[PDB]
From a paper:
Classical Zn2+-dependent deac(et)ylases play fundamental regulatory roles in life and are well characterized in eukaryotes regarding their structures, substrates and physiological roles. Structurally, these enzymes are composed of a central eight-stranded parallel β-sheet flanked by α-helices on each site, known as the α/β-arginase/deacetylase fold. All active site residues were conserved, as shown by the multiple sequence alignment and the structural alignment, suggesting a general acid/base catalytic mechanism for the bacterial enzymes as described for the eukaryotic counterparts. These enzymes mediate catalysis using a penta-coordinated catalytic Zn2+ ion coordinated by two aspartates and a histidine (KpHdaH (1b): Asp181, Asp269, His183).
We solved the crystal structures of three enzymes representing cluster 1 amidohydrolases: KpHdaH (1b), RwDmhA (1b), and RsPrpH (1b). This cluster contains enzymes with efficient lysine deacetylase activity, but also evolutionary divergent enzymes as RwDmhA (1b) and RsPrpH (1b) developed to be active as small molecule amidohydrolases. For RsPrpH (1b) acting as arylamidase converting the pesticide propanil to 3,4-dichloraniline rather than lysine deacetylase. RsPrpH (1b) was isolated from wastewater showing activity as propanil hydrolase for which Zn2+ has inhibitory potential. For the cluster 1b enzyme RsPrpH (1b) the deacylase activity was almost nondetectable, only for the H3-derived peptide APRKac we observed a weak deacetylase activity. Only for RwDmhA (1b) and RsPrpH (1b), which evolved toward non-protein substrates, the second proline is substituted for an Ala suggesting this position being important for substrate specificity to accommodate the product. For RwDmhA (1b) and RsPrpH (1b) we discovered a hydrophobic 22-LFL-24/32-LYF-34 motif in the L1-loop lining the substrate binding tunnel, the sequence 98-GHLAP-102/107-GMLAP-111 as well as the sequence 342-MAEAW-346/352-MFALW−356 in the C-terminal α-helix lining the active site rim. Notably, for all sub-cluster 1b enzymes, except for RwDmhA (1b), we found an acetate molecule in the active site coordinating the active site Zn2+ ion. For RsPrpH (1b) and RwDmhA (1b) the data suggest that these enzymes represent examples for divergent evolution developing toward an activity to convert specific substrates, i.e. propanil or dimethoate, while losing their efficiency to deacetylate lysine side chains, supporting that enzymes with different activities might be present within a cluster. For RwDmhA (1b) and RsPrpH (1b), we characterized two examples of deacetylases that divergently evolved from protein lysine deacetylases to enzymes with substrate specificity for small molecules, i.e. dimethoate and propanil.
Residue numbers in the entry:
A (entry chain D), D (entry chain F): 9 to 379
B (entry chain H): 11 to 378
C (entry chain A): 9 to 378
Write the structure that this text describes.
Amino acid sequence: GTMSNTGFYTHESTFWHSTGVQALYFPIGEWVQPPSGTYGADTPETKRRFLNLLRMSGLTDRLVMPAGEPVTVEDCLRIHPADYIRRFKEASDAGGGDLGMLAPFSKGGFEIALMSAGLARAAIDDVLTGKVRNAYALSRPAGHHCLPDTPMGFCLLANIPIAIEAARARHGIERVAVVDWDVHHGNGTQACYYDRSDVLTISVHQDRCFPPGYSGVEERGEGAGLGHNINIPLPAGSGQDTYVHAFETIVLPALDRYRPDLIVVASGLDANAVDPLARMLLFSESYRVLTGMMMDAADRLCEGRLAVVHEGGYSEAYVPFCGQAIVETLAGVRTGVVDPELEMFALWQPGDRINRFHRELVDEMAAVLLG
Amino acid sequence: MSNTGFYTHESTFWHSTGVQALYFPIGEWVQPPSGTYGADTPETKRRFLNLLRMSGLTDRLVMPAGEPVTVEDCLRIHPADYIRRFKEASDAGGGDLGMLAPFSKGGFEIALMSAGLARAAIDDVLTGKVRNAYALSRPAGHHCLPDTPMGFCLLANIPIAIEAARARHGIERVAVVDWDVHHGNGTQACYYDRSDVLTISVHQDRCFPPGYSGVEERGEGAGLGHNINIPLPAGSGQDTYVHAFETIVLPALDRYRPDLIVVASGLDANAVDPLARMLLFSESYRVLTGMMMDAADRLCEGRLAVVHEGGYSEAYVPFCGQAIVETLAGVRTGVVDPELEMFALWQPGDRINRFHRELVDEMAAVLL
Amino acid sequence: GTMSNTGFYTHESTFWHSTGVQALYFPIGEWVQPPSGTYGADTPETKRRFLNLLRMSGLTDRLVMPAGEPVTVEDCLRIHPADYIRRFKEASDAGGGDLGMLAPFSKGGFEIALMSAGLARAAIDDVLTGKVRNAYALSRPAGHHCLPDTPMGFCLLANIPIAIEAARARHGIERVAVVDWDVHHGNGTQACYYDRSDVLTISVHQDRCFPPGYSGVEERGEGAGLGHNINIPLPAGSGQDTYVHAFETIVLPALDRYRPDLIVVASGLDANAVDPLARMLLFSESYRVLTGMMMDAADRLCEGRLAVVHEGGYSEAYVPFCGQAIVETLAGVRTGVVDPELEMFALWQPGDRINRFHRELVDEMAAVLL
Amino acid sequence: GTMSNTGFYTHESTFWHSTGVQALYFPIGEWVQPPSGTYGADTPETKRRFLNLLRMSGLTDRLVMPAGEPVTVEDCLRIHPADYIRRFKEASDAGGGDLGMLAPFSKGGFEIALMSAGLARAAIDDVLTGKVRNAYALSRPAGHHCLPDTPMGFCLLANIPIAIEAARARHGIERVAVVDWDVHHGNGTQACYYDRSDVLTISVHQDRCFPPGYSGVEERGEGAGLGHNINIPLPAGSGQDTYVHAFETIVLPALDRYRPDLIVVASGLDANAVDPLARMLLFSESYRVLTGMMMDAADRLCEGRLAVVHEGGYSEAYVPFCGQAIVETLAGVRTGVVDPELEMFALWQPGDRINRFHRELVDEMAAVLLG
Ligand SMILES: OC[C@H]1O[C@@H](O)[C@H](O)[C@@H](O)[C@@H]1O
Ligand SMILES: OC[C@H]1O[C@@H](O)[C@H](O)[C@@H](O)[C@@H]1O
Ligand SMILES: OC[C@H]1O[C@@H](O)[C@H](O)[C@@H](O)[C@@H]1O
Ligand SMILES: [K+]
Ligand SMILES: [K+]
Ligand SMILES: [K+]
Ligand SMILES: [K+]
Ligand SMILES: [Zn+2]
Ligand SMILES: [Zn+2]
Ligand SMILES: [Zn+2]
Ligand SMILES: [Zn+2]
């Protein structure tokens, strides 16, 4: 019982990153009144409360929890140009700033970003060397929107690509699949590997949400990357049925065709049923099913090698239950935690008429993407 | 001076639901919140009023001093036992006498004031002191059953206000159009067997009450045909809402011929609300308010009273509320909604909208 | 009866000024963790809750509440150099900043600072023209630490000096007294008039608090201003007895000798018993006493002309009861408001031994200053 | 580098205790408006931020940090009557309550109180068995105002007395000294041992603060406890000089005469210079001095056996720097932490004239209490 083979990678400094004073994500000034209680959208508590519940549940006693270690600037330069890293560190040493679109940070945010990327790097490395069978990295700030030279949407470094390239330099790995179930499009991961065949990048996201107006079915890669990028925009208001169907008919077959040597999941929990930053209806049970599917795929394709890296998630109240369910599934253990909304959110799921239409939309995309 | 009344009182912001994480009670697995506590926080309503003041619009609004309803007003809807137990709990430490309707010490008096804002707004529209009105009621009312508070609602604000107007003025027909994203089960129950109020609810399918749709609940006895439930799919945007108003709500009002239109205006269908999955934004509420004003112009001499219900985004509710009041008053301000472009880009695609329109068209045929 | 002759000057935009993300007033960074919940020290709620209680009490029905109007850049230039105003406006048009010592502000803070100063200007003007007998201006951001060229300690413009100089240009008023009972030293007001006899500046403050380490008894002005500045540093831990003694034996006699044509109170409420930014023991009853004393002085010396301008106060929970008590005293009415801490904060007051010693310290200052 | 002999005892559940909605400590109601941001006075963050800074500082890598274990009902009954324990458990199983004066708690507060007391019990036990040389227990809820029959002032169980009596039953310890430097009077500790000679209870506190109006110099015990209780009320506005003089002239000589076999410090951090709940002027350097004096006393009198148990402290911004200073002193190490208020809070200290008068008051008390 005792110790599982699942690693959980976290460091206190990830909770010290601050985006500044916003009302939700709206900058103050003009017509947006400063907030009185919670400021910001990516608040530390939207990630800390997940860790706190994990500790209260007792699960941490059964997890491998290594000390966090930051990436180096050299690790960053495998993805980002030296000019971006210089200006980022320069602003961080002053009073912070925002070098992209909706990517604010405070004094010292550079070092925290290095630690966050280091949690992902260590999780992927420890899975590859067999120190653990699978892993969850509680990275904050997130990574999947960060382009090589432009931070975006709360993401300051390209966490997953940095971790993959660091692993390639130290281990060599023939093919990697990144499955992004954060509710927003993983435009950063897509851009980092768009012209390459050695990473299959898959994103399931709310149609048109972030980047705003973007769907992306027709963006399949270019050059050697043609056919190695898969975008699955789902309608707002999709629930577990739609997500499970997209995984069954698109994600899983795409992974079987590609035969990766490692599966990385970009795990945003912002598709949850009460998140302010999207319109989806997933709940804790949904994340159990999706995690189980990814574990099954990793078991069949790459000896169970599955690394899960946190991205978004904006409900302080409900994100902890979804994260708890993921880690429980990775570790193969249940706890005494009771999700208080388990039945309510099941009753909120769309009816059969809506689910049938959403499946038809998914089937149409599966024909376009897999044939 | 505009001819639009805005009814608000400071005490409505002093009602508190207690410590919850969102709406989850704290306990073994729900950690107490660190920043904002609760879901119906005072700021989800005060920030609307604050923006109205910053915009200058309050200088052109009629803003009477709030006056609470009396126990006699409450007893037209609620049994004396409920009102007694409510007052007794409020005089102690508060409590929760229903399902998800917590309140603190003194919450009874605040609920009387909240209902009084709705009573005054409706009365002032009926007597013509103002052409239309917005009542910033908190706590909300549209989930409150005659003997059971529910879903943040402690008294049946709109029904108390209608029955108070009837007791002085005698009104033959009133229509209540509820665009709060949750089903107005309280309004529905107060008038379910009556023809003198047409109750219409547009709500997210299955949301609150959880799993409830309600198309088939069309009234009973003398009220048969006088209740209309319009469940819309989660993820519906402006196109779907406007179509449901064009094809169901407005035709239903035309047939019924109300002497007064009351809108139960929750702002929780907004695109970033935590408590629903809809995609309305400030421009959507301008369109819907314009449609209700045009209906009131055609049917009842512009008599339109708008009573606040839900809305849970502290950041974004103010811009939606501002847009409604600007539309009621017929004046624009310098306020620019910073999310106008983004929330337009978020709207559903044509394929989704076409399917949602088919679903609305099917209900329109059934609902006559 | 019906309406009073007391004005209350407030504008919604004053609550929209933000100092940014700080833990209390500490900047976030390597060792100061970002706060969860309340960020900053000068939070909007430390002033808005005062107004909210005033509304709940019903007192606003009987107060004159004119619409707020800002001061102009021209009004500011009577005190501040154009270079400061230009750099302040420049930073405010971008993303905010901090041009001094512990004076952060956000985008648009310049226009809000103009409105805050405008509340003080209008309050003083309306008292002078007789529109109201007395007034309270809920200014935020505060003003009494702002030097002519350097903002400091949450103060971005010199509210009271700008208001006084505007009243001079408009009405030619000759002698004004400023009595500053904010718990911190009014170094800005002192600096603005240090060489001038047409304003008597008096500050009662916690010894060494803000500016840190400053006491100031011997700084009594210069030139024509010699004898027209009075600093009364009181020990940390002083309560109502000590404050009342300093007012009876120093403040009131100084006003009698100066013969002002207007009394302005710089009213910070941060000497209250639970404030985080000072160590004093005043409570709502204390502010009734001090306000009555200032009203008595104004009644004797300048026909009741008394304008009260808000400065500091950092207890969201308790500042409202102190502000309410001041405004009730100014209007000569009582309300149904019950201060829940009256019994406890009276029990917290220092014992006789300490009060005796504090009185001796006050007596020594009085012998020097008078 | 390597491990210190200092224990730090904390459990996640102590941060889940909630006092409910109060503005500061004022109950909400007709004239106290509900708070917007921070609710309550004893907020979880007033203790968690101390732990968070300890982790950031790297000091935790060199501290012994055992898993928290709660006390049992048997342990509580050594101090509290069965009727109180029964009623406390009953209210906790429902929806919480307040069984005393200013001691609210929420559902499940009973189990959390048992854990909080357990942190103190284990700290004292491990100091006594030699598992660590000294220890800090981050107890929350606090204990030192709790009377045997009546909770008070945020304290639900008598943490320190429960811990001492548990140590007596298991180890037979003969004499213990409790030195309470929380800014409020330790009326709970005083009551628990008032007629006993086997605990010397010393409290340094702001005169008249809490319980309100209480000074207490003349309350020196009864029966076998005569001369074994020492109250040192200091004036509001006292700073480091006054506190240090009180320790040099009263606390340290009292410990030398009593010859304890263990020293327990009831460590509230609410004498700090920005605390809302008192009027004192201590800062992080002051707590280094006071902790060093207690360590020197323990070194001379009881083989270094010193257990420090958290009580109050209500500045979220500043309490962490004071707690960090104490633990660094116990462990005998420095870190990279920079207290940002060192220069300002030194400038705030009282002038010579006040310090001389406060010293005279202290001298008069030493003449009554020790001679
Ligand atoms: O359909 C059942 C119906 O029963 C009636 O008694 C309630 O008042 C209605 O609101 C409800 O919908
Ligand atoms: O007066 C304003 C000043 O008050 C002092 O007590 C605080 O330490 C400073 O941070 C603040 O700026
Ligand atoms: O404070 C502890 C003691 O205080 C004394 O005044 C009481 O008489 C004692 O019974 C009590 O235990
Ligand atoms: K995605
Ligand atoms: K509805
Ligand atoms: K002063
Ligand atoms: K003490
Ligand atoms: Zn996301
Ligand atoms: Zn609603
Ligand atoms: Zn001050
Ligand atoms: Zn204390």
